[PDB]
Amino acid sequence: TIQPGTGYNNGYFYSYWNDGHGGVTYTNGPGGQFSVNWSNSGNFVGGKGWQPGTKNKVINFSGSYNPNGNSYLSVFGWSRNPLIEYYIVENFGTYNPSTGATKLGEVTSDGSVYDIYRTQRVNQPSIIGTATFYQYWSVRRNHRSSGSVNTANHFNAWAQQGLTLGTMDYQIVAVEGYFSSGSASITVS
Numbered sequence: 001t002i003q004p005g006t007g008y009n010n011g012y013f014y015s016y017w018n019d020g021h022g023g024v025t026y027t028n029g030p031g032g033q034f035s036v037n038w039s040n041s042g043n044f045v046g047g048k049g050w051q052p053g054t055k056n057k058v059i060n061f062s063g064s065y066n067p068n069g070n071s072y073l074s075v076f077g078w079s080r081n082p083l084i085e086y087y088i089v090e091n092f093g094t095y096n097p098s099t100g101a102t103k104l105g106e107v108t109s110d111g112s113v114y115d116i117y118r119t120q121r122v123n124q125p126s127i128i129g130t131a132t133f134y135q136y137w138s139v140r141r142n143h144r145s146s147g148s149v150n151t152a153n154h155f156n157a158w159a160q161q162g163l164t165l166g167t168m169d170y171q172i173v174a175v176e177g178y179f180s181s182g183s184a185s186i187t188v189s
Contacts, residue, residue, distance in 0.1 A: 001025035006051075006170075012188065013051035015172055018044035024177065032188035033063075036175045045076070045176045048188045053077050053171020055155050060189045061173045062146035067093030069180025075149050077171035078127050084165055085121070086136040088114070088154050091143040093180060098139050107157035109150055112142035118163055127169055136163045145186075 001024075006015045009028040016026040021042025027035045034048050050057070065073045075088040089097060101117040108114070117137040123130055138154045155165060173188045 001027060009048070012048040013170060013172065014046075014048045015170060015174075016044075016046040018042060021179075023181075029187075034186055034188075036177075036182070036184045038177050038183070039181045041177050041180060043176075043178050045174050047076065047172040047174035047186070049075075049077075049170065049172030049174075051170040053168040054151075055165070055168065056152045057171065059149045059151060059171075059173060060147075061090075061149070061186055063184065063186040065091055065145040065175065065182075065184045065186065067177070067180060067182035067184075069093050069182070070095045070178040071180050071182050072097060072174075072176045073145060073184065073186070074174055074176065075151065075171065076174035076176070078169040079166040080128070080169055081166040082164060083126060083128060083131055083133040084136055084163075085126070085133065086158075086165070088138045088140075088149055088151065090140050090147065090149070091145055092139075093182070095178075096139065098137055101137065104161045104163060105157060107138060107153055109138075109153035110148055112140050112144075114138040114140050114154070116157060116161060116163070134163075136165075145184075
């Protein structure tokens with residue numbers, strides 16, 4: 001594993017964060033590749049991509065994703081002004097992160113319909129400190145662990161629905177886990 005933090009590896013931005021509970025290892029491989037192995041973890045997020053992201057990026061990903069419990073595989077990032085955390089969820093484990101959330105529409109992109117949702121985080125950690133902020137979600141109906149994400153289709157559908165994004169901060173393909181186990185090996189481009 002590598003040390004939690006952010007940086008560059010083989011031309012790609014990477015972010016690896018965990019809550020210190022233990023049970024998760026993250027490694028950066030050649031090119032846009034990263035691996036995650038976890039067993040009875042706490043909360044963590046790790047992956048590769050770009051700093052800053054863009055609003056018209058076509059993100060390609062490929063590999064394997066084998067969660068055992070609560071975990072997501074997503075295009076994941078933030079905007080500033082307004083502060084927004086966003087997800088384009090390609091696959092997940094035992095928990096659909098939109099459970100109980102307000103549905104804001106649908107969008108068809110890259111071979112599947114996605115359902116759109118908005119949630120809110122109240123006084124939670126963020127890229128600027130403790131804050132209350134919205135989260136935007138596109139949740140893919142047809143799960144997969146390889147493919148291409150035309151981010152503009154999502155960002156445009158969100159904007160159409162009144163879900164506005166500010167200036168992009170980082171934008172990665174991320175494996176997130178919440179107190180679960182699993183393995184993943186993903187290559188980004």
